[PDB]
């Protein structure tokens, strides 16, 4: 009868931002003051809702989106943001309702030789709609000649590796981000505050 946020936050593996993972939360009581208890959070920002009223609100569904990005890219996981992540990887709506949670994960996602396993999308023909997910690998046509699925000049693989080394600057270090989107529809509520 208590929402298992630990499956999301205390998970051992995190998705790349371009293939960001989503988990649904329902049929439980969400005590956000207990979630805010982890003093390890470098970012805990809620939008469209008052953080103190969180334990007094009900919603139709709550979604937990989790992924990994750079340090100085957490600023893009917010409504109205632009950049490689907000345009091509993960996009929140203007009228977003939920919280953005993030913490430095340099000890987990960095290797001394360099961890390049976390990916992101670098090019895309158009920006992402809110909560749109693109895991395609179409050869991006940067020039005017078609690519026909062949990499070459002005025909680039759309994905790119990050490169997390423990001796990087804090803005190039891996951060893990959880977004708790709160959804209100004409359906019975499944998540409430205590």
């Amino acid at each position: 009868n208590l929402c298992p946020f630990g499956e999301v936050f205390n998970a051992t593996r995190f998705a790349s931002v371009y293939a960001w993972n989503r988990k649904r939360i329902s049929n439980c009581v969400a005590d956000y003051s207990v979630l805010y208890n982890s003093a390890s959070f470098s970012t805990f920002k809620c939008y469209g809702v008052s953080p103190t009223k969180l334990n007094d609100l009900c919603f139709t569904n709550v979604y937990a989106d989790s992924f990994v990005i750079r340090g100085d890219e957490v600023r893009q996981i917010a409504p109205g943001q632009t950049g490689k992540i907000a345009d091509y990887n993960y996009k929140l709506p203007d009228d977003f309702t939920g919280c953005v949670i993030a913490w430095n994960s340099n000890n987990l996602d960095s290797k001394v030789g360099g961890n390049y396993n976390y990916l992101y999308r670098l090019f895309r023909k158009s920006n992402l709609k809110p909560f749109e997910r693109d895991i395609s690998t179409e050869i991006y046509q940067a020039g005017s000649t078609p690519c026909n699925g062949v990499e070459g000049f002005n025909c680039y693989f759309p994905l790119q590796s990050y490169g997390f080394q423990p001796t990087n600057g804090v803005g190039y270090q891996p951060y893990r981000v959880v977004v708790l989107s709160f959804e209100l529809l004409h359906a019975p509520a499944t998540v409430c505050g205590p």
Partner: nanobody, 130 residues
């Protein structure tokens, strides 16, 4: 595969005038983030770069293999190929793969002037003999 690793394939004993395609399958990341260069070490001679390719897929070749070799990229298989045509006995060597990362801003690391690579495969042997 937490660390980046390269593995070469395609080596074989071939005849003069024959052709081979060597593969460089990478692991632990997108090879499309990396400059890839091919090298060969013949017995008794020094290690010699033969072909490389930028992250924007610009190619360059040593003068000793120009017009005969073709480097190409297939990042869908995390692989960079090397097509070798009109093989002569002087091509007999251990052909090894090499990679080094290119940050998105510094999108010029890769040209054969950047011949200091960080990751290396074990090499595959190509023997050209009648």
């Amino acid at each position: 595969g937490p660390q980046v690793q390269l593995v070469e394939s395609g080596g074989n004993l071939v005849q003069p005038g024959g052709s081979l395609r060597l593969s460089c399958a990478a692991s632990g990341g997108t090879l499309a983030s990396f400059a890839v260069g091919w090298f060969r070490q013949a017995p008794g001679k020094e290690r010699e770069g033969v072909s490389c390719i930028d992250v924007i897929n610009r190619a360059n070749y040593a003068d000793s293999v120009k017009g005969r070799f073709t480097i190409s990229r297939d990042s869908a298989k995390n692989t960079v190929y090397l097509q070798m045509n009109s093989l002569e006995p002087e091509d007999t060597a251990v052909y090894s793969c090499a990679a080094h990362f290119v940050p998105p801003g510094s999108r010029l690391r890769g040209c054969l002037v950047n011949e200091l690579y960080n990751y290396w495969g074990q090499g595959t042997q190509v023997t050209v003999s009648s």
